[PDB]
Design a protein around this ligand. Structure first.
Ligand SMILES: Nc1ncnc2c1ncn2[C@@H]1O[C@H](CSCC[C@H](N)C(=O)O)[C@@H](O)[C@H]1O
Ligand SMILES: Nc1ncnc2c1ncn2[C@@H]1O[C@H](CSCC[C@H](N)C(=O)O)[C@@H](O)[C@H]1O
Lengths: 274, 180, 273, 178
């Protein structure tokens, strides 16, 4: 209810990956004051460094971050995160659940988020977002919704991209449950994402079939095609001499860019826009 | 500005243990609410059931709380519930009122779990030969037809296994809360 | 001496690799009527197919190409080629020479070129080019110059790029020996070719660890190597290839500014966009 | 189109004047016989190393009617022979007779055999053993206080048997005979 110049957003991104959040914020025209990211995979760190010109401040393991660190590096306006899910997904029979293995990393989020929320009486806008997979134990989803005091929103990237990617999103971002908008930049069909000389079998691709035909033979998706599918700029992940398995793994763990765009869009009215 | 009876929140295995130690040390109790993990399925003293039913608003209403205890003499599930209850019961920034907590577990745990608990609680444990005891209590600062009323009900029940030597850890509470 | 409308160039590229010739011809604004390429590496074929929208007519092994094929697919205006040099380079001690191993592939060129030369009395412009390495046996170089009836021109890509790549070029292209032009697009220094957050140790790469990133040492990335050799960034980013495959394809490739320098005079002989 | 004239031969075959001897055996008039030989390093003539022979030399000494090469690594020999053949071949539109023959040993890499058959566009003639490629009528094959002292040995041994001569027999139906 007061007057002031809208200021650039301050972001804390845990489990940053290939810095999808910063890319989405840049694409929206939102000015980023600073972007502190916690990531351990060196390949993802190299991707972020090269593609965002070192603007990202890397702090390493999320478990090396203390509350004193959150207050000194802070304040923060937006806290985003997507913890690893190899111990949360039901497709893994050796899953250790939300509380053991790599699932317990989620609590780190719940830790730092509570270390980052404005103290009582601070009416400043503060937003947070936590993404994970839909294919998890109902006990684990109920426990996450208990710890975050919010119910998740289910968004499938197939509605805005060419990939069957349904994900749960907890958070307090404005209008998370609002209908997604299919714009013109959205490549809804897999054929739109393929390189020249290839033909797509299905309309959408899933994370035993090889989806593309090339000449007289069958083939899996290329990394550039996978980038177009997930909404990333072409050759986004073309750094660091990493193996093809490395690029495919990095893109597999990544968020769908149009989905995160849909989620981050309402932030344009709360911060400075270039 | 004057001593008042203690208010406790217990996630420990066995609702009795904490209140028993408190009555042993002779500390007045104005509120004691207990809950269990119950991971399988779903005036002063009260039992509230599954911890999965206890919300932040419940801690607010039942509160304020002065002591928060947890643990047991699957090691990750109960500690994180205890951490959530601690965060929900902590006094807000700017409330210098006393607030203590204690978490007991077995020494036979994964070293990863021990390091994680020490990190999350910002405190190093107390070894008692053997159990680990984390806490902010003074002294726990550590460096690095026509028959019986009873009838069977088909359940196993726990007990209070800790001796008054473990209550010696709680002993400093007598200097912070009213004693009868 | 007569009048006619300039027509698009017809090209025959043997040992095409990654269509360095087609890319150079497109960059120069020269209209390409037809581009028939002979290449056997499937990775290179995929690169050339994807990057040029299937404009390339791939005929496979150069040894499955006959003289009747040159007449029926012809006429051709330009014939370019760069045979493999693993049996020509003095670095390899197990080299088999020009006449054995993979060196004899050169003769295939010498074959098809003579199968594509305009017959006597045909005053039409016809150009050819054959590239290979400088580090070869003096006898093999003398033999190649004897077979092609031309002395080679030595061009080192270090003069217009950031790579110590000196090569021999035989051919009849106009003014091959003319001085090269260092333009503004030329990234002469290895630093200009690096991705963000890396520092170059040497001014030009000779392919130890050429770059320093943060506190560690590292070799050149594929995009950096593309910038070094004059290729557009992410040119070779198709086909789920292994990193070794990308480094191998870029190693065997021509330096783009050098081929541009060689092909530039062709603008006054054919139709230009 | 006109009366027969003597034959003119260009010989790179290992062993000099072997073809001259065979032509003398078959009684064919020879108006020119130029002979050369491949070397490791530096009206009937021997012109030395084939590396010194150019297209202009083939034009001056020419025209040629027969081109012979081979030996009773194999690549260098055949490829020098191919260069000489290409330089001596009549241009398109010249229907004048022009024959060639290339002999090698059967003991060769099968890759080399197929490469020679491809380059010469001809399948070989096996003779109990040597391989003979040629365009002579009959070789068409389907798909399979004394003077001498102190010098580096110059043994001119070369096999010119009647069967080998037989291959050259059709030549007497195209050129003048003494
Ligand atoms: N202990 C830890 N601290 C910080 N990051 C971690 C971590 N353990 C795993 N990670 C990283 O967290 C990532 C989760 S996958 C999510 C990545 C991100 N949401 C994106 O869209 O790119 C993984 O890439 C993994 O490298
Ligand atoms: N027998 C053959 N027929 C056709 N191409 C061949 C071949 N043997 C090898 N090659 C190809 O010839 C290439 C020679 S390296 C030269 C590549 C090209 N000049 C460029 O600039 O990209 C190699 O990539 C190899 O794949």
């Amino acid at each position: 209810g007061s007057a002031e110049k809208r200021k650039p957003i301050r972001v804390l991104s845990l489990f940053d990956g290939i810095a999808t959040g910063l890319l989405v914020l840049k694409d929206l025209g939102i000015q980023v004051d600073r972007y502190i990211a916690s990531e351990v995979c060196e390949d993802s760190i190299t991707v972020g460094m090269v593609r965002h010109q070192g603007k990202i401040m890397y702090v390493g393991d999320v478990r090396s971050v203390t509350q004193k660190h959150i207050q000194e590096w802070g304040p923060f306006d937006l806290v985003i995160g997507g913890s690893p899910c190899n111990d949360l997904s039901i497709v893994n029979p050796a899953r250790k659940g939300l509380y053991e293995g790599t699932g317990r990393l989620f609590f780190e989020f719940y830790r730092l988020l509570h270390d980052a929320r404005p103290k009582e009486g601070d009416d400043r806008p503060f937003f947070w977002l936590f993404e994970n997979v839909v294919a998890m134990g109902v006990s684990d989803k109920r426990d996450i919704s208990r710890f975050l005091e919010s119910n998740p929103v289910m968004i499938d990237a197939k509605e805005v991209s060419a990939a069957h990617r349904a994900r749960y999103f907890w958070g307090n971002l404005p209008g998370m449950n609002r209908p997604l908008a299919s714009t013109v930049n959205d490549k809804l069909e897999l054929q739109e994402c393929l390189e020249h000389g290839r033909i797509a079998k299905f309309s959408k691709v899933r994370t035993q079939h090889f989806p593309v035909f090339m000449n007289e033979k069958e083939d899996i998706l290329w990394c550039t095609e996978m980038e177009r599918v997930f909404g990333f700029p072409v050759h986004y992940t073309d750094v660091s001499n990493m193996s093809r398995l490395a690029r495919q793994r990095l893109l597999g763990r990544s968020w769908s860019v149009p989905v995160i765009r849909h989620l981050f869009a309402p932030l344009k009215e709360y911060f400075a826009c270039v």
